[PDB]
Amino acid sequence: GPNVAFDIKAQAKGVAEYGNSIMTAKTKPDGSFEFNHDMIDGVKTIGYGKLTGKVNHHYVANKDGSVTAFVDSVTLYKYEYRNVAQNAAVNQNIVFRVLTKDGRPIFEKAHNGNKTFAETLNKTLQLNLKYELKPHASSGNVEVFKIHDDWVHDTHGSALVSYVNNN
Amino acid sequence: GPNVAFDIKAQASIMTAKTKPDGSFEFNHDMIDGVKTIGYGKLTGKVNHHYVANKDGSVTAFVDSVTLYKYEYRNVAQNNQNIVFRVLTKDGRPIFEKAHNGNKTFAETLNKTLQLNLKYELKPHASSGNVEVFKIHDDWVHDTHGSALVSYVNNN
Q1: Rg (CA), chain B
Q2: Considering only CB atoms, which chain A residues are within 8 Å of B49?
Q3: How far is the alpha carbon of B47 from chain A, nearest alpha carbon, in Å?
Q4: Which of B124, B137, B134 is nearest to B63 (CA)?
Q5: If you write DSSP's letter for every residue of A61-91 in order, what string do you get?
């Protein structure tokens, strides 16, 4: 039967590809995963974010030692954020987004980073991918969704005129 | 005839003069980065107003419209930054929007007149108070955008 190593990881859009932005998720072989990120304000850590989910996949072993990996879909369960300290970039806000491979947003959460919370997504995104894998073959890195974790600084203002009759 | 003091200010980073009594103005703003200023923005325009003296001592200030000429940006320090400058009417309709990364110097021409059609009948020492004539957004995003990537290796 199969002898497949599964992983999931997150890499920031650079180009980069020097490997420094890569975060490996805690995973199980059934596809379960969990990403943890430190949120920086940026004098120190103000909180920890956690995205949980599961890749739905299954494997068929062949006689010759090759295997077929079916990557059916990927489910996102929760996004949680645990505030630890007060945000000292006090006019900046955080936006966390998850999007499909194709750029379509499916979750968005804007917040100031000072409140703990948990949001439930329970969103399954269909992939229907198949990798025919010879001995020692790798699928390589296959995007299954996108992530945005942004700092927003919004100086919103208005132009005010005034007139005084000095007589 | 008319003795009226005109002013224009920004309230909510956005500094407020220069101003001339004919209504011309410019707004200057600094983009900050850390505490090492990256560049300077400047928005120029003119308020279109005029004054009618009454026998009373009283004056009517007609605030007809405001014209926006240009938005200029000057990069002073080189270098994942989206910066967006917007101008909107006092009612919330965007009339100009510029996204940029901050590394290039540029000028955009707006030449937009926003009709105001306001009138303040001003008795001696009366004041219009603060009248909003348009809005500005000088937003700044630090992007960390990426992908979740799965991988499968056949270890046979």
Answers
A1: 22
A2: 163
A3: 9
A4: B134
A5: E-TTS-EEEEEEEEEEEEEEEEE-S--SSTT
